[PDB]
Write a protein that binds this DNA or RNA. Sequence first.
RNA 1: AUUGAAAGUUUUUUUUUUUUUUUUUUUUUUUUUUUUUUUUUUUUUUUU
Length: 139
Amino acid sequence: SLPISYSLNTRSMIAISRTEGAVARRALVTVEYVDVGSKFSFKMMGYNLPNYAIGYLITIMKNIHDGFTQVGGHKSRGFGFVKFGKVKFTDLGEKRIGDEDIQVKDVGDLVEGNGDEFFGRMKPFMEAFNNAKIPYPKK
RNA sequence: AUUGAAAGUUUUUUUUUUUUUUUUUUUUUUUUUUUUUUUUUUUUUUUU
């Protein structure tokens, strides 16, 4: 991902607090993060992906977008939360790959827009993936 | 002092020419630099 409008900002958590005792300063630490509002170009590509696999990838992306999943170092402190404002989806090739694929409504090839309407557009893919009997592994 | 002898088996001729150890063969397949840490305590906006 290539930053576009990136802005760097530091923060220090040198604070050791009361430490449930008497000492209020024992150690020191500071971190450098990327400030909010930065923009990164995100691109990923897939080969011979069936409809259910694409829907599952879209489900992963939606979980990331909603905030249920976070990316970064200090996730417990609420450091990594990213959202999509403009994402294009281009499909080239066949519509279904395997016999296990669900025939999805033809949404075309170029799917784009704001993040919310984007995920609203990929509803058929996620619905097909959820309503897909996954054969493998046989076990 | 042999019946009794005096003659190099020698000259001359390049084992040479033709022929690429060559074609095909992606040092790649997988792994989130995360993880625990409160920028906290002390100080009367105040006198001849």
